[PDB]
Scaffold this motif. Structure first.
Motif, PDB file in Angstrom:
ATOM      1  N   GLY A 114       0.791  -1.230   0.000  1.00  0.00           N
ATOM      2  CA  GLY A 114       0.000   0.000   0.000  1.00  0.00           C
ATOM      3  C   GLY A 114       0.820   1.275   0.000  1.00  0.00           C
ATOM      4  N   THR A 115       0.194   2.365  -0.423  1.00  0.00           N
ATOM      5  CA  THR A 115       0.881   3.656  -0.575  1.00  0.00           C
ATOM      6  C   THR A 115       1.640   4.116   0.667  1.00  0.00           C
ATOM      7  N   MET A 156       5.120   3.085  -0.094  1.00  0.00           N
ATOM      8  CA  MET A 156       5.585   3.026  -1.475  1.00  0.00           C
ATOM      9  C   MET A 156       6.755   3.958  -1.758  1.00  0.00           C
ATOM     10  N   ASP A 192       0.486  -3.434  -4.118  1.00  0.00           N
ATOM     11  CA  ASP A 192      -0.553  -2.431  -4.319  1.00  0.00           C
ATOM     12  C   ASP A 192      -1.892  -3.128  -4.097  1.00  0.00           C
ATOM     13  N   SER A 193      -2.772  -2.521  -3.310  1.00  0.00           N
ATOM     14  CA  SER A 193      -3.991  -3.212  -2.875  1.00  0.00           C
ATOM     15  C   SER A 193      -4.940  -3.514  -4.023  1.00  0.00           C
ATOM     16  N   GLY A 205      -3.077  -1.105   1.353  1.00  0.00           N
ATOM     17  CA  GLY A 205      -3.485  -0.057   0.422  1.00  0.00           C
ATOM     18  C   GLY A 205      -4.955   0.322   0.571  1.00  0.00           C
ATOM     19  N   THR A 206      -5.295   1.515   0.130  1.00  0.00           N
ATOM     20  CA  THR A 206      -6.643   2.036   0.272  1.00  0.00           C
ATOM     21  C   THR A 206      -7.550   1.478  -0.772  1.00  0.00           C
ATOM     22  N   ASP A 207      -7.025   1.261  -1.967  1.00  0.00           N
ATOM     23  CA  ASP A 207      -7.843   0.835  -3.104  1.00  0.00           C
ATOM     24  C   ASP A 207      -8.852  -0.289  -2.783  1.00  0.00           C
ATOM     25  N   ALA A 230      -2.568   4.956   3.889  1.00  0.00           N
ATOM     26  CA  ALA A 230      -2.339   6.374   3.682  1.00  0.00           C
ATOM     27  C   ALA A 230      -2.497   6.752   2.230  1.00  0.00           C
ATOM     28  N   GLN A 231      -2.782   8.027   1.997  1.00  0.00           N
ATOM     29  CA  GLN A 231      -2.825   8.598   0.655  1.00  0.00           C
ATOM     30  C   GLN A 231      -1.447   9.058   0.154  1.00  0.00           C
ATOM     31  N   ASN A 262      -7.489   2.720 -10.521  1.00  0.00           N
ATOM     32  CA  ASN A 262      -6.586   1.593 -10.611  1.00  0.00           C
ATOM     33  C   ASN A 262      -7.336   0.278 -10.629  1.00  0.00           C
ATOM     34  N   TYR A 295       0.294   5.290 -10.354  1.00  0.00           N
ATOM     35  CA  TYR A 295       0.575   3.938  -9.888  1.00  0.00           C
ATOM     36  C   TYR A 295       0.854   3.006 -11.047  1.00  0.00           C
ATOM     37  N   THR A 326      -0.557   0.324 -11.186  1.00  0.00           N
ATOM     38  CA  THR A 326      -1.888  -0.253 -11.378  1.00  0.00           C
ATOM     39  C   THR A 326      -2.895   0.698 -12.034  1.00  0.00           C
TER      40      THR A 326
HETATM   41  N1  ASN Z   1      -3.232   5.148  -1.260  1.00  0.00           N
HETATM   42  C1  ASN Z   1      -3.156   3.860  -1.603  1.00  0.00           C
HETATM   43  O1  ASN Z   1      -2.867   2.987  -0.804  1.00  0.00           O
HETATM   44  C2  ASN Z   1      -3.488   3.519  -3.030  1.00  0.00           C
HETATM   45  C3  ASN Z   1      -2.666   2.364  -3.571  1.00  0.00           C
HETATM   46  N2  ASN Z   1      -2.882   2.218  -5.028  1.00  0.00           N
HETATM   47  C4  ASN Z   1      -3.037   1.048  -2.953  1.00  0.00           C
HETATM   48  O2  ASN Z   1      -4.202   0.794  -2.653  1.00  0.00           O
HETATM   49  O3  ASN Z   1      -2.151   0.200  -2.779  1.00  0.00           O
END
Ligand code: ASN
Ligand code: ASN
Ligand code: ASN
Ligand code: ASN
Lengths: 354, 356, 356, 354
Positions: A11-12, A15, A77-78, A108-110, A135-136, B265, B301, B303
């Motif tokens: 997740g972000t 990253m 990445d989620s 990740g948030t996704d 987190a964003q 994504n 990303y 993704t």
């Molecule tokens: N802010 C995030 O975590 C978004 C990222 N693409 C995720 O879900 O891994």
């Protein structure tokens, strides 16, 4: 002292840049060591602690919080996460359940809301906190939401006995199976549309103990790896043709969440209804959820989707309905009737009955 | 005086009970006559007005508002509405465009946002207000939101020159192609997540003139009946298999809105990407919209869904992206590249282009 | 490419410590900040052999490196003990060092933050650089706090953007200082700007409302007003408030008062009360009418509307801003009462929106 | 059938223009007769009802609602209202308590919150709904919030047994002693900052029965006309001088609400504290409320206002603190200590204890 396991899935929050895009970044424990808010060096040497184990500075009163970082590999990445990934996480929690007083999962948030809901169901009779956070903006970027989101998660798991899969973001603790992502850029990324937060952090910490679920000390933790994979989500749109629905509901699909209009309605055109009926005869189970963020699915209209093998999802999020569908269909040796009855019950605090 | 056409398409605002469920109810004009807030009898006889034409009482200032009720047949629950129904409505507005200063469309909530967005595109160079409205509770039920929603729509259309397809509900006027339904029970049923309301009604009326679009007096109204029917919406969910996507995107589909995760994504698994690529080669156009209510689709990303025949929808609602997809694909004799360029442009105030 | 800021630490919960079981102001801020990587880049400091008084933020995404110097006022104060004189002292600090620094951050308690921001807004005439007030609900020495991110954000805003206004930064929002008021005594979202958007928002990226931010007047020099009238007050009406109590409140030597009134700007019409307001006016007192309501504007319309001799409408001003504006205008030398009233009715620092 | 008394005290809901300003307008019953939503003519003649009594059309379920309009004279802009006016209203309710199943009071917005809070205290052991309502735009003006506000009040009083002084506006029912006015132009004019609404109206009616107070069927209605008039409200501002506070607190004042900064703080300068102390020796009682809209007064700072004859108001609105102060000080033959003890108790649902 209280001991937590920090499971870093990706997740972000963690990253790094590469090729001008963000990708998953390893070496979290290495970074966290260098940050006083996340690791008290003086205390660690004073107790000659192991190299794998970090220590939060102290609150005036209450227990000291220690934690161990488990970095999954590969980190994701989620958007690449699935049921199998969430099962893996549940199994990590199962393996180490006795050694730790609580858990934090960086994610990740996704697909955070899907993951929270899935773990909520997989972890039957859970007695300890499992706090998802994300987190964003990455923690390595100076201006971020990562630092305070991670710290808050650790402090909640470390200090309060909330036996639920939760999401902690932006000074709020939400019931995991009650959240959905509402904002793709802002730090207030998630909403719990049909339930108050379980907790809020400000000058003091306010917990809604009237909502938090009760620890069932007698019953042991039962982890469900038996989650049905052949479930799907299908969002209606105006004029959606029957032939497209027919294709969507072909075997081997066992369950589907239909996201419907308004209070739970769809087109009444017969060829469409015929396909839902045909799917029911094949033994498919259907859950009716509203596309609307807030409110409940309710009958009342000639367009209300009700009938053979259609269970109302009431005020469930779609992430929660899908996970519940995966859970109920994965249980062995139940009749279709029984399965439908379990879907219509509040099993983990995800659904409010009228 | 100002003259409006009230087009009654159906929807809960006018429904009745039958068999213990709500269904569409005819006879709206008959009801409205009996309500002083909707028809000034004294004034009507004083001007010996026609039997088809109702007259609002005097508002505080400005012109007297008169209106005529056109009751569609058959009346529909908005869940049964399609592109053809919305085309029929646009054509009603076209037929009577010169006789009336504005329009109000009574419509169900279930697909209101799709209808508003579709009309927004079909009515090119629109110069007059077209105000959609609806209700959560029928006007024949005593405790309702119908009375004030209908009145407000008539008063906005009747008194202000806002040349847009709008939605009026619960004392707010929204840009039609900017709304989506967020609450299935409450009277605050709609939200405009990425744009302020065009107007708010309270003690006084506040209009955001800085956002309202400009009347193009030179250009005539062009109504687009040529809207592409073979478009769809597909929402991603975790682990969605490639074979299911393959099936979804089979011919004769021409366009699809993919509702994706977060900032735009999806899964990077190759068999899935392969199907999107295969669809592109068949000539399919894809628009990427976020499942999130608020914010914009943005790259960043590994993704992020970008590539052949994939246009970013930025901050568009999915209802708007679907209608825009229907409009652009319906235009005659354009290349795929041209069509993509039009999708990436703000055509009716539905999309905000990013900053630098 | 470096930018230099002065961090003025006046007190407030952000830096407090426990003593006798209560929070009190805590010295030694610079000592703490050195030990925190997010607030001081040790590697870079030694690499440029920087002075001992000067801290250095890590690299942000883009733009200039930000350096800052901590000035710790003495004595440090809980903001409830702050007065006009304290705010004048601060303005003078900014005046003294105006040329050496590209911007300013003031650490301040929340209790009177809004009053302080509004006061500095007026005292610093023709301001060309950012002055960002910030604070916290929980001290920075307490592990779980809002202090770390509030301080960092203030430094990054002052350090990276040319917003020539007295602002408040809290909880990822930048507000115009003379537009804020405190709405929550416990939550981190403690302040609201009820009648104006924030000047900026911080998320994944930074959004600034440049069409609201005021313009730098590069010709005109900074004029700091130490001449602020101390004999001004605020009086909140409550139902049945007796004339004799008002009489007492408005006795000499009071020169100005903000009356916080009901609703759209109304009070009791009982004659003995009106007579006292009138008597005060003859003694030369000036009165500003503000609404007790959080949102909206004072407007005429009722027989109870407070208007008349020496009563100026405050329109949509916060009461903190009206009081500071009253202090500023009354402190100007050699103006008639009529002139002073005309200045009050003008938007002097972006604190008031005029109707149309 | 259920019978309500509609008490029309004045307020914008019924105002008219004169001399280019709004003033109170008589003849409400005459107007209401002509509106089908407010009076069912067919049914009235079918039961040959009296000329003073109106009848709502049938609602979805339950009892038919009838009501009688009592138009006070003279009618008032709520800015001119005082304790005596609210006592007159309470006495109207007392006089007719047995003849009616509930009450609706049409009232101006300007002092609505003070009026709701006052009636809340005066009407001890209340068993029936008393619903205040008002509007931002008069009912005679075509585009208004008056019609639906008045109807909703009647329907709530008429159909639900909520034994509280409430405010109904803009599809929300609030506890009367919990509200304050937040917007001077918008229809959403009131907020209940520290308590959910008691009810919400939408497609269906949601009531928070967990919050609604219990009917005390044993205890009779006791109306308190003995409300202390010599109470005041004083808002602190930075630098407020001791001499001005001295003057404010002179006899014959008996009680005061001090609106303080933040979590309940003020200047610690000794000459100011000396005056609060001097007032206490004269026997004055002081309640500490926060200027902030949301949150609670709490100790924690060296600037916290606590001491002799200072009672914390916790999360009370200032309108409620003033009314409670008026009530407690009006009770006969109690010691100062007893009075303070009563102030620190939740007497009508206006205060949340920790
Ligand atoms: N802010 C995030 O975590 C978004 C990222 N693409 C995720 O879900 O891994
Ligand atoms: N409230 C409504 O109008 C819902 C209805 N099913 C419709 O869309 O026609
Ligand atoms: N949180 C705070 O800063 C409140 C403190 N009493 C102050 O104003 O200094
Ligand atoms: N809208 C209103 O009711 C305000 C009016 N001035 C009143 O309190 O009577």
């Amino acid at each position: 002292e209280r001991h937590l396991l920090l499971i870093y899935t990706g997740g972000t929050l963690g990253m790094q840049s590469k090729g001008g895009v963000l990708v998953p970044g390893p070496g979290l424990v290495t970074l966290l060591r260098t940050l006083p808010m996340f690791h008290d060096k003086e205390f660690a040497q004073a107790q000659g602690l192991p190299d794998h184990a970090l220590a939060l500075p102290p609150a005036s009163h209450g227990p000291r919080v220690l934690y161990t970082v488990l970095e999954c590999q590969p980190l994701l990445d989620s958007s690449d996460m699935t049921i199998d990934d969430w099962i893996r996480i549940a199994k990590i929690i199962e393996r180490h359940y006795e050694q730790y007083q609580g858990f934090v999962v960086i994610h990740g948030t996704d697909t955070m809301a899907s993951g929270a809901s899935m773990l909520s169901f997989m972890l039957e009779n859970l007695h300890k906190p499992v706090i998802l956070t994300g987190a964003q903006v990455p923690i390595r970027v100076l201006w971020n939401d990562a630092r305070e989101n991670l710290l808050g998660a650790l402090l909640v798991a470390g200090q309060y006995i909330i036996p639920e899969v939760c999401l902690f973001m932006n000074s709020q603790l939400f019931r995991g199976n009650r959240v959905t992502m509402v904002d793709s850029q802002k730090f207030e990324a998630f909403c719990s549309p049909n339930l108050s937060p379980l907790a809020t952090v400000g000058a003091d910490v306010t917990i809604a103990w009237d909502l938090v679920r009760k620890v069932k000390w007698k019953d042991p933790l039962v982890v469900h790896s038996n989650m049905e994979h052949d479930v799907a989500l299908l969002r209606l749109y105006p004029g959606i043709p029957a032939s497209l629905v027919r294709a969507f509901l072909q075997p081997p699909l066992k369950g589907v969440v239909l996201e419907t209009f308004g209070s739970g309605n769809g087109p009444s055109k017969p060829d469409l209804l015929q396909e839902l009926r045909a799917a029911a005869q094949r033994g498919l189970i259907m859950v009716n959820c509203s596309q609307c963020l807030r409110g409940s699915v309710t009958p009342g209209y000639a367009t209300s989707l009700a009938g053979a093998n259609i269970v109302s999802g009431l005020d469930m999020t779609s992430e929660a309905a899908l996970a519940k569908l995966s859970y109920v269909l994965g249980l062995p040796e139940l009749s279709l009737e029984r399965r439908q009855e379990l879907l219509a019950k509040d099993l983990r605090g995800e659904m409010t009955l009228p």
